[PDB]
Write a protein that binds this DNA or RNA. Structure first.
Ligand code: NA
Ligand code: NA
Ligand SMILES: [Zn+2]
Ligand SMILES: [Zn+2]
Ligand SMILES: [Zn+2]
Ligand SMILES: [Zn+2]
Lengths: 162, 162
DNA sequence: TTGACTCTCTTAAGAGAGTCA
DNA sequence: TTGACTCTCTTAAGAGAGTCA
């Protein structure tokens, strides 16, 4: 098994490569009517992506390193968290984009949490709008708001009470 | 089936049958430290479920009726909305449980909205904790809270900024 | 050892349709 | 006609593993 020192070297090589990705400045809602700025380090749209990186799906990538003749591979956003517990409360940990920008690999825009926690950030009011996430959101979730409900609760007769 | 009259008859027979499901009281968080009471009309756990109903999955059911010698079948929670547009902004409309209780078929606990709007209610703070859903939530979402994030954003080197 | 592709899978909110009696 | 089962699919947040040169 890879030693903790070998893992740190993988994280360091990953950071060095991602750090050279194009850095894109995005203006984002923070909640409470305030605007902020996030700086995303975006993997390219097509090959080559960077040393060690390859695309396994339309918005999925993996990082690969060969150590002592053994090929090791990880989901491309999971590498910052290789020295962390990989589950919590019986749930698998997932890389969660605080910036909601899938191509971004900035580790300052990622956290490591259950898929439910991950998904829920899509609807968070944001760090200036009432976010209660203990690891705070960086921005208001892209799906926050009144929604677009087509039809509400209703009955034709009188069979039901709320 | 095709005619508005036929559709209304389908909705009316569905309401009559669901109206005879056991009524189960559930006390629920509303947000803001307040509690409310919902009355769910719960489909039985095992057959027989009711005239027209059959289970197609662990928590999936379908309603079916024979109209002009032809069988018509719908997802069991979609029947209240048969007269509504089946899509919004190019997204499929889905039956959305305001009570977060899949067995419940109370149409006063259902709305008709995109799957994204549907999912997002799981994390809503609730009608007394800041819900902004235009069709208001009946309760705080079951997944609302600080989360259980294992690791937050971090970097080892000095290549990234927020 | 490396790049650039290929494939299928997980989850939890939701769906459609066929086989029998 | 009605009931009670069976199967796979959709979405958008996420994954692991194989092939070839
Ligand atoms: Na996410
Ligand atoms: Na729902
Ligand atoms: Zn980012
Ligand atoms: Zn948040
Ligand atoms: Zn209910
Ligand atoms: Zn709400």
């Amino acid at each position: 098994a890879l030693t903790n020192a070998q893992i740190l070297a993988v994280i360091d090589s990953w950071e060095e490569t991602v750090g050279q990705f194009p850095v894109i400045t995005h203006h984002v809602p923070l909640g409470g009517g305030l605007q902020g700025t996030l700086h995303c380090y975006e993997i390219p749209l097509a090959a080559p992506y960077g040393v060690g990186f390859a695309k396994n799906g339309p918005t999925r990538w993996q990082y690969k390193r060969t150590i002592n003749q053994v090929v090791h591979r990880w989901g491309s956003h999971t590498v910052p968290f290789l020295l962390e517990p990989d589950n919590i409360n019986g749930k698998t940990c997932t890389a969660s984009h605080l910036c909601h920008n899938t191509r971004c690999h900035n580790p300052l825009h990622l956290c490591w949490e259950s898929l439910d926690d991950n998904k829920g950030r899509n609807w968070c009011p944001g760090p200036n709008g009432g976010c209660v996430h203990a690891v705070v959101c960086l921005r208001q979730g892209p799906l926050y708001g009144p929604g677009a409900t087509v039809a509400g609760p209703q009955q034709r007769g009188s069979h039901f009470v709320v």
